[PDB]
């Protein structure tokens, strides 16, 4: 007996939530690109070792771990498909700030995020085709957004390059600009948490299911651990290890929601309509825990 | 394709998009053009 709120899409609270999300993204990207250099980005582009290992880790671990979790946990056909689309999605921009929290060579982080988004728009239908075989004999190849991906990539790169230019041109705006941006980010985050709690209501109890919670808990943690292990095994720098892992662990869950909404009616995808939200909150919690653990470990090294 | 949504990296709902004029939140969201949805009779069957 799963029932969505009577007016979910059309409500002042939902429009407000979307507006604050957009503002959060813009200000986060501006204050996050305010700590990069063009020369380091060019150097990372000209040395594609880190980008290659990051892409290999993402597109060979996340879809594979989603498929293995779906097979092991004996999920339904729709449930096993929902996790698979999340696994095939590109790494989100949360990885950039998450790596910022661990001093992780931000130029490599932004390079990996951009190239991962491009390779996603290139090869996500291929991964879906070769991994979905067995569930949903349907196509699902024309449901992944294509122009939207590149438009979003450009629209998130614009504030990043604006911040980079601001840092390179005149640095005395940093203290005034950075603090304000941070303040905006904190206010927007508390507002977005409150608004999400208000909008979701008591309907979140329906989608928690022990299996859904379990898979959405292991998947980001498994991604983090596997990415770190692979980066360490490839004899990479300690700074690059953290960013590679915490990029391969994060995912862009908006694509999974949009594709599922386009392909299937809401009633078919009822209980797992909130799966992207569960993945987002679980990955946020695990990232915060990892950041706290790393900071405590660094405090031990003084 | 049939999907013309501008994804938001920090988004978890279909209406979380980067479109300036938030038509998704209005009463006529036109970001999806697939009325030929699949009911998937064996969606809830394991294997």
């Amino acid at each position: 007996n799963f029932t969505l709120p009577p007016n979910f899409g059309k409500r002042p609270t939902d429009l407000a939530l979307s507006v604050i999300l957009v503002f959060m993204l813009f200000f986060i990207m501006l204050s996050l690109g305010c700590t990069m250099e063009f020369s380091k980005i060019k150097a990372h582009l000209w040395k594609p070792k880190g980008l290659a290992i990051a892409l290999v880790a993402q597109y060979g671990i996340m879809p594979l771990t989603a498929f293995v979790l779906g097979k092991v946990f004996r999920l339904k056909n729709i449930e096993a498909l929902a996790i698979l689309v999340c696994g095939c999605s590109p790494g989100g921009n949360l990885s950039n700030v998450f790596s910022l929290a661990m001093k992780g060579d931000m130029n490599l982080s932004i390079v990996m995020t951009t190239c991962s988004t491009f390779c996603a728009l290139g090869m996500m239908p291929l991964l879906l085709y070769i991994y979905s075989r067995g569930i949903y004999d349907g196509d699902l190849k024309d449901k992944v957004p294509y122009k939207g991906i590149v438009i979003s990539l450009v629209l998130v790169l614009i504030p990043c390059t604006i911040g980079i230019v601001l840092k390179s041109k005149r640095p005395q705006y940093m203290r005034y600009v950075i603090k304000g941006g941070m303040i905006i980010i904190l206010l927007c985050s508390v507002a977005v948490t409150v608004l999400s709690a208000i909008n979701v209501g008591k309907s979140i109890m329906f989608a928690m299911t022990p299996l859904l919670i379990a898979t959405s808990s292991l998947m980001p943690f498994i991604g983090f651990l596997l990415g770190y292990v692979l980066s360490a095994l490839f004899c990479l720098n300690g700074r690059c290890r953290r960013t590679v892992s915490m990029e391969t662990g994060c995912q862009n869950v908006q694509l999974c929601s949009t594709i599922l909404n386009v392909a299937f009616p809401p009633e078919v995808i009822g209980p797992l309509f909130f799966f992207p939200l569960l993945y987002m909150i679980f990955q946020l919690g695990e990232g915060l825990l990892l950041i706290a653990i790393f900071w405590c470990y660094e405090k031990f090294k003084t | 394709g049939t999907n013309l949504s501008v994804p938001n990296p920090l988004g978890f709902f279909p209406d979380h998009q980067l479109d300036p004029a938030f038509k998704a939140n209005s009463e006529n969201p036109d970001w999806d053009l697939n009325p030929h949805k699949d009911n998937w009779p064996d969606a809830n069957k394991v294997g």
Partner: antibody, heavy 118, light 108 residues
């Protein structure tokens, strides 16, 4: 072969609610949508709404939102429809249809005739 | 709300002649129209879905294709069993409206 059986003819005074039953058979029931279609005396069809048997999700037409409630009773595999406050304007045959895969009405019932008079 | 209109309310067909039932849409729907046949004793049956595909069971003589706002349903040779009321339904928008008015009869 899938076959749908309806409750039968009904006769209700104005303002007294009625219920329509649609006994599904020939398939496992809880994987296909059930849509209800109302035909006027002249012979013009209007789509009322649908119900998902697996979770009871419903969505009605704007006109019929006030006076249409859909239940499934998955144990007996017989969908129901209630009309609450019926006036003399609504009458004639109501059909239950089973939507198949893509959005088209595949198999229809024989139809239930409803007459409202005092 | 899309208003579905059918050009003719009653059509004469005789026997062994093909009748093209024309359905016109208020706005563009782009190949999201279905066809239904209602015999005189109720028993509504679906003939064509997605405007080009025959439902499993209907005779192969039923056909008809169209795109945009103009649609057709061809019957080819007409048997006495194919004397009924034919409806065109769209599902481009949620209300799912119907045509509602095409009837067939024998010429004499």
């Amino acid at each position: 072969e899938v076959q749908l059986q309806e409750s039968g003819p009904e006769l209700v005074k104005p303002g007294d609610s009625v219920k329509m039953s649609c006994k599904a058979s020939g398939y496992t029931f809880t994987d296909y949508y059930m849509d209800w279609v109302k035909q006027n005396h002249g012979k013009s069809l209007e789509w009322i709404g649908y119900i998902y048997p697996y979770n009871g999700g419903t969505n009605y037409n704007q006109k019929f939102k006030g006076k249409a409630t859909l239940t499934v009773d998955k144990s007996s595999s017989t969908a129901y429809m209630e009309l609450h406050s019926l006036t003399s304007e609504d009458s004639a045959v109501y059909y239950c249809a089973r939507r198949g895969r893509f959005p088209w009405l595949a198999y229809w019932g024989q139809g239930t005739l409803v007459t409202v008079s005092a | 709300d899309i208003v579905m209109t059918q050009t003719t309310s009653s059509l004469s067909a005789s026997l062994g002649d093909r009748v093209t039932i024309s359905c016109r849409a208020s706005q563009d729907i782009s190949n999201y129209l279905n066809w239904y046949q209602q015999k005189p004793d109720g028993t509504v049956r679906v003939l064509i879905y997605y405007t080009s595909r025959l439902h499993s069971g209907v005779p192969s003589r039923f056909s008809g294709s169209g795109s945009g706002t103009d649609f057709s349903l061809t019957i080819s040779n007409l048997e006495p069993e194919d004397i009924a009321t034919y409806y065109c339904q769209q599902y481009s928008k949620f209300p799912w409206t119907f045509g509602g008015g095409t009837k067939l009869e024998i010429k004499r």
